[PDB]
DNA sequence: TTTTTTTTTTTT
DNA sequence: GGCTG
């Protein structure tokens, strides 16, 4: 198919749609908009469940409200035949910033031992030394607007735990804020100094031997050579130590997305971790530590004797499925 | 002028009586117009009357439409009004609009077809017509008109019937008088003639005999052989015309001197045409390839045929359907339609030879329920004959013709007659 | 829809007299519509007549309603429509509305019954029906139909049935006295009637004679031909109607002047019908293609026939069998059933012809046992007339008509009769 | 691929001699490609030869272009090399490119015609054709195949045809005088020959007899077994060649001395060929496997077989159709077509067996209709003989061979002849 | 060593004669290598000859896969180049590679069958 | 069904497929009539004999004993 | 269901008679389950009778492992109870468990063989 | 929509 | 703030 011309035609046709958004990352062409087929959610007028994907082999539209999915050509012919004919004829026609200041931030290692967040991190059972990499803020929106103005409409006083993300050079080019309260718009609000900032945590702290890729940076704290891809799309290329890295996901065997990711990793022949014999059964490492009492050295012992790759990984995954 | 068309469908009766049977949902844009026409058509199908504005507003409320579609339909219904105009400009304007919409739809369909064809196999859409089907679609769109003839109306179409009585179509005579008797003077120009027969019973023998007979009458004959080499067909023709058996030619009984003398004696005769034999691989030729062959024959040899002969219909390519897409019946019917269209376009008598089913083999009588590949061939054909040399006709050096479908005359007059097939000379002689 | 229902209750008579007995207060709403209908019902009860707008407003003024109810009723009364919608659509739509509202009310009632059932027995309403009454309640919701006509009810439709026997509502005369005598007034609508032809008996002569006779009596005739073209069948029709011999047309004895004069003389007569001749290939017309042809003729030609004449039953194709045979019993039985179903569903007299058994061919007498179609045609045919042509009858220009199956009347009343067949004009004349 | 087309136009005479006849400026582009082709066409018109790079550059200097077009043409001309690609792929690819560009141009032309038609008559251009020219425009763009050969002429090529009559290199003798007599010189290369009979009648016996007869004539024979093992069939070939028995081999009546003496005596003969026996599991081979087997045989040993014997076509597996995708009439015919294509590609005589349905397993005669698998096999076949054995025949050890489909010669000259089949020796013996 | 195998399938008639009968599409990769081999196999089935670089580029342009796949195939084709080699080392190495890929596919299918039957 | 209670059974009497005789090395037909049953014998006919010539010794009478489920020869 | 299997090996008798011959130390685990089964098998080999819980504690005391796993083993033998389950279900579930573990071990073994062949 | 095996049934 | 096939 012809992705670029389809993307252009979809852009022309859907420029006028409600909630139209040009959600285009560095490698994908997605358009977010309110689904004209169903008007998206009747209750929520700000929902834009109409999505066009040009990254797909053929730019395809799908609504998450009316569950209407089709190619761009089908929608164009069934809704705008006028430009559809011109498009179908065209078918054969073609034929960096570094964060330097920490306003309203007090590092946990230098924070007072009586601070409530210190007590919470004790409930989180984080190693004391790791506190020299985490700050606490009472003015997270204020701090972000001080560093990146216009981010927050109001600089409300919100206490969060700020983990700066240091590049291999050790330069904080981003930061993730964890809301202390159980209720929040997002558990981990991550803001980067520049769009090309590193999405991998602990890169500056990588040592010799195998490197363990985890989910949460706090989880990586308990682990030597623990790096954390800070959200985003899992891309092998952006990940260093492509020779020696070790994949460690959450212990959620019945969860479908986790096993999908693990299948993706193993099909790339990677070296992954398996929990099919873990004495603890919590979802993640920190949960095993705080609940099952799991201690980090036992965890490392288990993991160094549970890494599998290739056919070994595949067969050990089959059993771990369910 | 969709709004005017809908308004005068709702508010006018003579306009509705004149234009409704020809309107279709595909003639309207996918916005409010198509949905409003859907409501009107559903109401007419359910109650056999033209709906009012209240009926449609009731039908709109009792419909599964989105908010945008509902708003568009309601706005379009509100905008409808009975503008007084003349019932001679409305009909012609509606006809023009319908023709334009049909042409637009045909253009979109062919543009899509071309896009589908260039796709690699195992990804391209199936059941979608190939590139060779493009002109036929464009022939259908131009035929849209608000005038329709369904059957012959007595007392309403009687001038044409009198013309048919008094006038007779031109006929290309045969050389066998029996065929002229059963066809009232021969075969017409734009026709598809088929000589069905069993396997190895004389399909090519009869076609080569016809080719020789037409060549002796001064016609330009094109023999498209899809199964045999050019030299083999030309040797059959030589045996027919030089009165030498195929055994004599193969064994070398005749010398080059006698062969050259006979060929030059035939050349010196003024009442001789030109026969050109073209061989194509099995499944490698279609109607478009035949048209290219005709174009190159006219341009490079100054040759315009009249008696185009295809050795076997079942081997040729569909030209409208992709290979191995539909069943044998549909593909063979499409081939027959394409060949008849080619014959009509080129004004050439087209002769072919299909194969009967296994049941008809060694059967003393055959009928229309014996065609192997497709029973739709008689419908497309204009004259169809059969060969019944089963068990004892071969010993008597004879044959039999059933006359399965004869559009030139009446099949039940000389339905079965005996033909003296001579296989050494590859010819038909008459028993008279 | 409620606005339309109330408006046409106020401003109509037939609609009121048709839908008032099936109209209840609970069918409308719990707001302005219910109050307006209560006013209408109160007025019709106190004064047995449909109220007017002024009377309705006076009643609303002298009524116990709050401010919001007063405003709603006033607005609804001011929003009445006197538009004259078609009666059939109005009745059907109000029936659907009533049925939907009744179903909704019954479902709500059974849900409330179930909810009350799951309550402390000491604490429940006594008036609420028990759970066992649920299946009956829904039945009362399903027993709502403005008009109940399921079949023919003996002792409840005897007055309408008598009007059928006196008015001969089903009979279609023949224009031949003998055929009317043995059919008690002609053939009936929704019937299949066939002619059995023995030796020297064409099947299309009798069919063309019947078609001409029906045409002279004012009936719309649809002649579907299989083995012949439209022009040939219409030429047989012309021979019978214009009194010109069939061979005279081909020879040219009759000139254009006489032909046109006779045709215009026939056109002047107001007792003449329309004849539509449609041709189909042999075996290419099942009794589902005929339905499409009828739909096209009704939509485009406005031609709704009362007589349908198929040239030959054997040549037709069984839609149910799909596979086709030249002379197979299973196909003939299916073809007859399909054609009779078409006749019943179209309320038309359907005519066809078949060949008698070989033994029937040799014997002047033809027995139902002596029929090519055994237990297949004398089972699906209301009338089966047999035609016998021997040497002595042919020398006297006659054919012996024998009655082999007569659903209409007694078969043995007048079984044998001599018919004056003219093979040149394709006509049947009576014999004194 | 315009660069490739231009490079092989300039730098290849064979390519120029087959594509230049069909090439236009509209086919290439609107930019540098069209200008380069225009320069080439101008140079070839002014001087009847293919230009060189230096001459093309000099002409470009002489010709006048704007700056952009001049730069584009210079850049394109710089990019021309010999690059000796395959001729067949090159001509096929340029034909595809020409066809797709012609289709694009035709679609644009008809779109322009439609756009001009909608314009008012005053504004519209008179040069553009009417809409009625849309179909043929799309048809002339579907008849642009690359084919300059028109075919035989029968009067301008009778000398070449007579010379072709003397080319008997296709014939392969049979070593049996009766088979040569009925085939007019034996079987021909690239033909599908079939030997059909019932179960346990001697089909593989006849195949092994033919293999031995061809081996004794010096041919290379490739026997492909589908049921039996390699050593079992080689035992039958040994029984035919050494001429002792089948049971005596297994009963020890032949000592190793006599066995060796005979094999070495046959080795000393210079008239002996090479025989390779290959076995395949049932339903696991076709021409695709056979072509790879042929390539491996040619690479490993100096063995190019002239005769290819397939144990049974039915046991074989079709290339495109899966194991049970479609019914027997299709996949069997597909396998037959693939085998004939393989034979005509390798120019080898292909022999195979066929099964007969149960209706003729105990009959004194077998017809062509008695083919157990698809009836398309007796359509792709060329010399389908038949083996019939009865009790009287088995008493005399004389199988009857009936000529079922004879494409080489007259099927009815010697229709039935007796053979002298010796079952112990697996040999066919002629009867005099 | 997929690049070497493809390069000597293109630029070596002796190598193609022995390895081709056995080469299959499931022995290379799920990305550029499989697509390039599919192009080569289609060309061989259509013309019974080994395609050249120009033929591969032409077939690549007349292909329907996405931008990533197109770029990968283009890079792989541009990297194909004949090298001074010896028939034996190549045939043995190709046999080892084909056997290893066959074993890998077999064990993957075995794992798939085991994890499918346990449903 | 047509071969049941018949004095002779042919190869064409195979029930479920005509391909079974084609894909079978050896087949033997067991035939029993009332006379044969009274003689405690069965006629075995060689229908498809791939190990030898079927014309020779085509039909011989085995001495089936139904009580002992045993075949015995008559030689 | 290793806990159920061990508990019904120690306590149940007919289940022990039917299932013991088809028991191997490779079917259970590489942790506390394997150690417990090894202790039970050693005891049944020494004394041709099923051991008791006190006997298991004595065997743990005299025959010791590294404390890291030894704690896990001693906390593994604290849950084995009588739990009179039905015989047919217990046998069927034990058979399914041992079959699954045998398939897993065979797949791991063939993967290791393939890995060794590559070396 | 045809094609081929096998069976079962029925009609002539 | 993402999430489809
Ligand atoms: N060389 C020949 N010499 C004499 N008679 C021949 C020769 N070739 C064919 N015939 C006869 O001609 C008859 C008809 O052959 P064809 O013309 O090929 O009929 P056909 O229907 O075309 O056969 P097909 O195409 O294989 S179904 C055969 O049955 C033979 O008897
Ligand atoms: N070992 C043998 N000794 C003697 N005669 C044999 C032997 N094997 C077969 N025959 C004879 O060969 C005749 C037919 O041979 P076949 O080749 O088996 O026939 P065919 O079954 O058509 O070929 P197939 O099925 O591909 S093996 C049988 O009727 C036997 O008389
Ligand atoms: Mg032929
Ligand atoms: Mg056999
Ligand atoms: Zn939606």
Author numbering:
A (entry chain H): 3 to 97, 115 to 341
B (entry chain F), C (entry chain A), D (entry chain E): 1 to 432
E (entry chain D), G (entry chain C): 1 to 119
F (entry chain D): 358 to 432
Give the text the authors published on this PDB structure.
The T4 bacteriophage gp41 helicase and gp61 primase assemble into a primosome to couple DNA unwinding with RNA primer synthesis for DNA replication. The domain architecture of the gp41 helicase resembles the bacterial DnaB helicase13,14 with an NTD and a RecA-like CTD that are connected by a linking helix (LH). The gp61 primase is composed of an N-terminal ZBD and a C-terminal RPD that are linked by an 18-residue flexible loop. Here we report a series of cryo-EM structures of T4 primosome assembly intermediates.
By classifying the primosome particles based on the gp61 primase regions and refining the entire primosome particles in each class, we obtained three primosome EM maps. The three primosome structures are similar, but not identical, to each other because of the asymmetry of the seam present in the gp41 helicase; they differ in the location of the two gp41 helicase dimers that bind the gp61 primase. The particle population of each pose is given in parentheses. These poses are similar, but not identical, and are referred to as binding poses 1 through 3. The poses are non-equivalent because of the asymmetric helicase structure due to the presence of a seam between subunits A and F. The gp61 ZBD and RPD bind the gp41 helicase similarly in the three binding modes with the ZBD binding to the first N-terminal helical hairpin dimer and the RPD binding to the second helical hairpin dimer in a clockwise direction when viewed from the primase side of the primosome. One gp61 primase has two binding sites on the helicase hexamer: the gp61 ZBD binds to two NTDs of one gp41 dimer, and the gp61 RPD binds to two NTDs of a second gp41 dimer. In each binding pose, the ssDNA 5′-end emerging from the gp41 helicase consistently passes between the gp61 ZBD and RPD domains. The three gp61 primase binding poses are observed in the T4 primosome in the presence of ssDNA and ATPγS. In our initial primosome structure, there was no density for the RNA primer, but the density for the ssDNA was present stretching from the gp61 ZBD to the N-terminal lobe (NTL) of the gp61 RPD; therefore, this structure may represent an ssDNA-scanning configuration of the primosome in search of a priming recognition sequence. The first state is observed in the WT primosome in which the primase interacts with the ssDNA template in three largely equivalent poses.
